Symmetry: D2
Subunit: 369 residues, 4 copies
Amino acid sequence: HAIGYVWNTLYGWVDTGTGSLAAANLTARMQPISHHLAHPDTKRRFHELVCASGQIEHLTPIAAVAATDADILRAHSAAHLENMKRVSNLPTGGDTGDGITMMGNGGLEIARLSAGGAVELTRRVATGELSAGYALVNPPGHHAPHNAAMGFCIFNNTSVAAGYARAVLGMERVAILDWDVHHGNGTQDIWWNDPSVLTISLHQHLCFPPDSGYSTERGAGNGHGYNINVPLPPGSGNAAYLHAMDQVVLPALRAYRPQLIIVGSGFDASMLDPLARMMVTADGFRQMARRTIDCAADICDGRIVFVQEGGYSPHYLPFCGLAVIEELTGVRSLPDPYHEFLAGMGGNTLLDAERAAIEEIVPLLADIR
Amino acid sequence: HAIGYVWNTLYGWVDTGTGSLAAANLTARMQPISHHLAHPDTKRRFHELVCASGQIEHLTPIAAVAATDADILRAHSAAHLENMKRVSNLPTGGDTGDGITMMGNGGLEIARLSAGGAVELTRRVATGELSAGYALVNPPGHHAPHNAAMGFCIFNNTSVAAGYARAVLGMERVAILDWDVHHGNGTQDIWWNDPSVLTISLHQHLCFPPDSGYSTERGAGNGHGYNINVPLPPGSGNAAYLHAMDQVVLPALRAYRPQLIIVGSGFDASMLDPLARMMVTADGFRQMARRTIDCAADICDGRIVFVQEGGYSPHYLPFCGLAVIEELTGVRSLPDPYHEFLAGMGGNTLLDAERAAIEEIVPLLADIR
Amino acid sequence: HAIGYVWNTLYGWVDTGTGSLAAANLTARMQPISHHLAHPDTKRRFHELVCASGQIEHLTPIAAVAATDADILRAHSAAHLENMKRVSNLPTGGDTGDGITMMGNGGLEIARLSAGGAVELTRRVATGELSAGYALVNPPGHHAPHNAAMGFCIFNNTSVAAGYARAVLGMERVAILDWDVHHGNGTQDIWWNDPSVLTISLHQHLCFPPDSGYSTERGAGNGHGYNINVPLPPGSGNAAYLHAMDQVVLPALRAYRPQLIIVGSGFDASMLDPLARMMVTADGFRQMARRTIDCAADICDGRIVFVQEGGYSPHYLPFCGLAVIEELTGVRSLPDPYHEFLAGMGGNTLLDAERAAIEEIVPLLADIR
Amino acid sequence: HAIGYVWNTLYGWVDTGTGSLAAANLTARMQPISHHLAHPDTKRRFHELVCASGQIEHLTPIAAVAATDADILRAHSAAHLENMKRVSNLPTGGDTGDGITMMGNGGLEIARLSAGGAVELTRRVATGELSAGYALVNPPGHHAPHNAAMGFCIFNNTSVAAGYARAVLGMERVAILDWDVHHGNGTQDIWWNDPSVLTISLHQHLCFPPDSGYSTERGAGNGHGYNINVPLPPGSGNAAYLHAMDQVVLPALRAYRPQLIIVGSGFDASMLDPLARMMVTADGFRQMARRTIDCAADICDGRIVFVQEGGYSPHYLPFCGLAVIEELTGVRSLPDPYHEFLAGMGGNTLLDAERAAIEEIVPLLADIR
Ligand SMILES: Sc1ccccc1C1=NCCCN1
Ligand SMILES: Sc1ccccc1C1=NCCCN1
Ligand SMILES: Sc1ccccc1C1=NCCCN1
Ligand SMILES: Sc1ccccc1C1=NCCCN1
Ligand SMILES: Sc1ccccc1C1=NCCCN1
Ligand SMILES: Sc1ccccc1C1=NCCCN1
Ligand SMILES: Sc1ccccc1C1=NCCCN1
Ligand SMILES: Sc1ccccc1C1=NCCCN1
Ligand SMILES: [K+]
Ligand SMILES: [K+]
Ligand SMILES: [K+]
Ligand SMILES: [K+]
Ligand SMILES: [K+]
Ligand SMILES: [K+]
Ligand SMILES: [K+]
Ligand SMILES: [K+]
Ligand SMILES: [Zn+2]
Ligand SMILES: [Zn+2]
Ligand SMILES: [Zn+2]
Ligand SMILES: [Zn+2]
C-alpha cells in the first residue's frame, strides 16, 4: 500500500487568458474577466486542500517528467504536436483551434508535464512500486483527439499514458474509465479502431461536444464493441451515477479484464459546477472511487491510476477530489462541509428516465470479449 | 413608452466576504477566495453591458431612494430591522443569521437602496410616468421572510414594493411573479394570509430552501389559494419554463387581474449557473419576458416592474439580463454570443416529468378569484 | 459654475492581459496574474467613488464622443493611426510596439473614446457651456509621441484635445501641464517645434522613459523655450511638488497666457504608488489642483480641463482623484481616510536636493514670451 | 553544503479580509477589494517561483513545526498569547488591535506555523544538519512587540527563533538583522534590555511605525548599545543599501561575534513596492545576501537563517526573493526579467543625504562589546 500523488507548480500557471470561455471580445461586448471558467486556481485549490488536510502525509509524492515527442506520438499526430509548438512560441500564446482552448506563452512545457505526470504515475503503479495513485494534472486531456486540441485539452493525457502502457510496458489490455461530465470524444477517437484500450465515458448527454457520445458510437473494425458511451440526462445525481457504475461500468471492466485501469477523474458532474447540470456530491464521488478501486483489486491486482480531467467549482471541487484521495489512502479525516447543504437538493433517487438511459447500455456488455 | 432603469454604485459594493458560500473556515479547510458565489461583480457586469451595448440610450435612468423604516416595516418586523442595523454597525459587518448571508460594514445603507430602488421604480411606473422598468438592485430579496434575513437577502425588495403599492398607492391587487430558480419562501411567508398580493414562484424543486416550495403551500385564511408554487425538476430548460408560463403563470395573472405585476427577475435558472441545475438560455428568458410584458399590456395597462433577484454566472448572466431589457425597450441590437454553444445542450423538448410537474398546478387556478 | 465630468463604461473594459507589466512568459518564469499593474479597475474605483461620495450630484455628466480620424491626425501621424486600426483587429489584440502596451481586441474603439472624452470636455469648457471639468479617461495618453504608441498610451489624449482647441476653436495659445509622475515624452515630442502649445512636465527624474525629461529638452525652432521639464528626485513629497508649482509651473503659465489649460492629471506620484517613488498625498494633489484652478481663473477665464493620465494604487488613487474633483466643485464632503497614516511618513519638508532641482528651471521662465 | 527551505500551504491561506489596509468601510467610502495590500499571494508567488525555477532541486525542504506556547513565551507575554487564542476563535476572525492586523478564523494555527517554521530552520542550521536556509513564512513578525500584535504581525517570528537559540540551543550571542523597509520596532522592544540578542534594523525613516526607528533608540541597561537603527531617506537604492551594509551592518556583526545570524528578510525596499519609497532591485538584494552569507562564513561557521518579513509587489517580489535563494544555493540559473527596466530608474549612486544618514551610525559601533 503506497499511493502516488502528482502535482507540479506549472499546472497552476496555465494561462487561460482574459475571456470567460472564448476570448474577451469588445464587438460582442464580452467583457474581460480575471478568471476564465477553466482557470487553474480550481485544481490548485484541490492540491492545497490535499496538503492542508494532512492527506499528503499518507501519499508518496511523484515528480512529473515531461512527456517526450515519442510519448505524445503514441496518442497524437506529428502535425498536432508541431501546431502546439507553434502556438506555445507566440509571445502571448493563443487559441489552439476551437476558439475556447487558450494556451499561454510557453504552455507546451505545461502540456508535456501534464501528460508526463500521467505517464510517470502509470509507470510507477505498473511496476508495483505504488499500489495506486492520483495525478492531479492540468491542462486536461479527454477532448483532444488524435489530430487536434479541443475543449481546454492540448494532449490526451490518459491516452498518452495508455499508449505508454501498451508500447513500453507491453500490456495487452488497458481500460480508460472517464467520469468527467463531458463526453470523452478525444479518447474515443484515438482508440476507435483498437480493442486493446477499452474506452468508457459516463457523461451528460450532449453537454460537450454537441454532437457526440451517443450509445451507438461503439468503435470500428476489431475495435467494434470496445468503446462504451453512457449518456445520462441533465439533473442526474448520486443514484444515477452509482446505478451506472453497478449496471454498466464495473461489469464492463470485469468482462474486459484490463491489466491497468486509468480513471479520467473529472469533478464537473458536481452539484455546483457551472459547466454541466448534474447533481453528484463528494459522497457520490467517494462511492464511485471506492467501487472502482475495489474492482481493480478483484481484476488487475489493484493497478488503478486516477488522472484529473475537468471540474469548474473552485468552492466545491476540492472536497470532491479530497473524497477520492481519501478512498485511495483509507484515511478519512475531514468532512465535506457542504454535505448537509447539498444533500437536501436531491439526485438521491433513481428516476425512471435515468434508469432507462443506463439500461440502454447493458446489452452491449456481451460484446466485450 | 418610457422604460425606467435603476442602478446605484453601491449595489456593486456589497461585501460578500472572503468565503465561498459560508465564511472561510480554517478548521474545516475552506480556503478563502476573492469572489464569493454571490459577489456583486455578476450584477455589475449586467449593468455595464446595459451601458456598453447602447441599451441605456433607450432607458430612462431612475435614481434609487433609500427605503425608510416605514417602507421596510410594510414587509418586515421591527426586530428584523433593528438586527440589521446592529450587524451593519459592526466594524467588518458580519453574517445576518443563516450562516450564508454576509452584510458588510455599513451594508444597511445598500439594503435600503436596494429596496428603495424597487419602491421608486414601482411608484414611477404606477403613476404612468413610465410604462415599465427594470430595477437592477443588489442585495436580492425573495428569501427574506417577515422576521429575518436569509439566503443572501436582507430585505424582501419586491414585498417592500408591493407593500408600498398597497398602502401608499391604494392598489387592491398586486402580483409578485418570481422566476428566480430558488423558491421565493420569504415572499410566500410575508403574504401567506393575504389575498391582496398573489405570490407565484417558479423554481427548481428543493434547490433552496431545502424544505419548501411544494405545491401544497397555498396560503392560509383569506389568503388560501393566493400563493402558487411551481416546483420543476432539475434539468428543466426553455421548453419546461415556457410551458409553465403558458399553462400556469399567465393564466394565474389573467385570473387575478392584478393592478401591478412585480417580476422577481433572477437568472440563476440559466444553463451556466453554479447554484442550480436548470437549462434556460438568454432566448428562454427573452420569451418569458415578452410573454409577461404582453400579459400586463392585456390586464393592468402595461404596469409591470422587474426587480433583480439572483443569478451567479458573471460570464452569462449579463446576456440573460440584456435579453429582458431588450424586450422592454423593443430594441434588439446585440446577439447572445453563447447562443449556438448552449443551444446544442438541450432543454428544448418538454419531458414527461417536466410536463407532469407543471400540470399539478393547473387545478389550483380555479381558486384564484 | 458648471463642472463637467466624463466617464464611459468602456474605459473600465481595457484588456491589459495576463502579465504584470510585460506579458506573462513561462520561460522567464513570469507567472500570469489577474491584475496587470495598469488594470482598469484602479480608475474605475475612482469613478465609483465620485458617484458614491455624492460628488456626482455637483457635476454635469458629459458623454464621451469618439475621436474621429481628423481629431487623431491633429496629434499623430497617419501611419500610427493606420497601425492602430490594424492591431485592433487581432482576435485577442496584442502589444502595439514597446512590449508593455497591450491593446485588447476592438480596442481602438476605447482609444477613440478616451481621446474623444478629452476633446468633448475641452469643447464644452472652451465654448463656455461649462466652467471646468474632469475627463476620467482610459487608456492614458502622455507617452504616445507623434508616430507611436508607448507606455500604455495609444493616442495622446491631451494633445488631441490641444490640437482641437487650436484648429477648431481657434485658440492661439494652449498649455498642457502634466503632473503624472512619469515624463510626458509623447506630448513633448508632438509639440517640440511649436510655441502655440506650451508643454510642461513635472516628473520623477528618469522614472519612465529612462533617457528623457532632462531640463535641457527645451523644444526647437520656433518652439525653443516652449517645453519645460521639471525632473524631481525620488522621494519628493508635497513640499517639493508645491514648491515646483509656486516657483516654476504657475509662473510659466502666467508668463505664457494660455487661453486654455489642460492638466494631464496622473496620481502615480502618490505615496502608495508601485510605479514611482514619490510621496504626494491626497491633500498634496488637492493643493496642486486648487492652485492651478485659481491660476486659470486669473489668466484664461477659468478655462481648465483635467484629463486622467496614470496612477496605479487601486487603494489610494480614488481619494487623490476625489480631492481634485472636490476642488473643482467646491464641495468638500469626505475625508481622506489615509490622511493621518500617510502624513506621518514625511515629504512635507522641502529638502535641499529637491529645492535645487526646482531652481534649475527658474532661469528658463524668461524665455517664455 | 545543505540549504534548508520552509514553506507551508497555510502561509498562503492567511485571510487578510476585504479591505485595502484597514477594513472596508462604507461610511468612509473605502470600497471592498479582492486583494488587501498584505494578501498572501505575494509570498506564494515567491514560493512557486522557487519551485518552477528549479531552485527547489538544490534545497532541502523542511516542514514547519507549530510553535508551542513555551516557544512563544520566549518572545511574548502570556497575556498576548492568551489574547491571540481568544481572537482566533471569532467566526470570521478580526483585527487584533492596531486596525490594520487581521487574523482570520482559526488563524492562530497559521501564526504558530509561521513562528515554528523559523524555529525549525534555526534548529537544523544551528545543530549543523544544514549550513543555512530560508524560511518563507507568513504572517510576518518584526512589528509585534512583547505584549501585542502590530503591523500585520501576530508573533515575532525571528525573536521566537532567537529565544529558542538562546534558551534551548545554549547560544550566548544571537544577531537579528532586519532589512524589511519598515522599522523592526517589535524586535527592538523584545530585546531592548538584553545584550545577548543584537538587534539591527535598516529601514526607511518613519515609514512605519510613524514615531520610531531613530538612531537614538539604543536599548537600555545591560542592553544599551545592543540595538542599532539605520534610518535611511526615501528614494534610497542599491548604493545606499550596500554602503549601509559595508559601513554599519557587517562591521556591527563582526564586532558582536554572534553564534547565529537571523535575517529578517523583507523585500518591501524594492523599486516597485507600494508600501515604501525605496529603490532596491533584485541585484541589490542579491549583493546584500552575498555579503551577509560571506560574513557569517567568517564569524559563525556560516550559521545564517533567513526568515521572510514584508514585501508587497506580487509582480517583483518573487525575483527579489529568488536572488537571495540563488545566493544561498550558489546556482544562478534565471535572470531578473525586470533588470534593465529598473536599472535605468537610478538609486545606483550614493547621494550625500544617504551617505550622511549612514555615517550617523558609525560612532555607535564602538559600544558593541
Ligand atoms: S503538499 C505540500 C504543500 C506545501 C508545502 C509542503 C507540502 C508537502 N509536500 C510533500 C511532503 C509533505 N508536504
Ligand atoms: S469490478 C469486478 C471485477 C471482477 C470481479 C468482481 C468485480 C466486482 N464487481 C461488482 C461487485 C464487487 N466486485
Ligand atoms: S450606463 C452609463 C455608464 C457609464 C457612463 C455613463 C452611462 C450612462 N448613464 C445614463 C446616460 C447614458 N449613459
Ligand atoms: S396574461 C393575459 C391576461 C388577460 C388576457 C390575455 C392574457 C394573455 N394570455 C395568454 C395569451 C396572450 N395574452
Ligand atoms: S455616477 C452614477 C453611478 C451609478 C448610477 C448613477 C450614477 C449617476 N450618474 C449621473 C447622475 C447621478 N448619478
Ligand atoms: S497663475 C499664478 C501664477 C503665479 C503666482 C500666482 C498666480 C495666481 N494665482 C491665483 C491668484 C493670482 N495669481
Ligand atoms: S516546490 C514544489 C512545488 C510543487 C510540487 C513539488 C515541489 C517540490 N517539492 C520538494 C521536492 C521537489 N519539488
Ligand atoms: S563580516 C565582515 C564585516 C565587515 C567587513 C568584512 C566582513 C567579511 N566578509 C567576508 C570576508 C571577511 N569578512
Ligand atoms: K477502443
Ligand atoms: K466522460
Ligand atoms: K398571498
Ligand atoms: K422562484
Ligand atoms: K511646445
Ligand atoms: K509628467
Ligand atoms: K538588544
Ligand atoms: K527593518
Ligand atoms: Zn468536463
Ligand atoms: Zn436564486
Ligand atoms: Zn505615469
Ligand atoms: Zn515591511
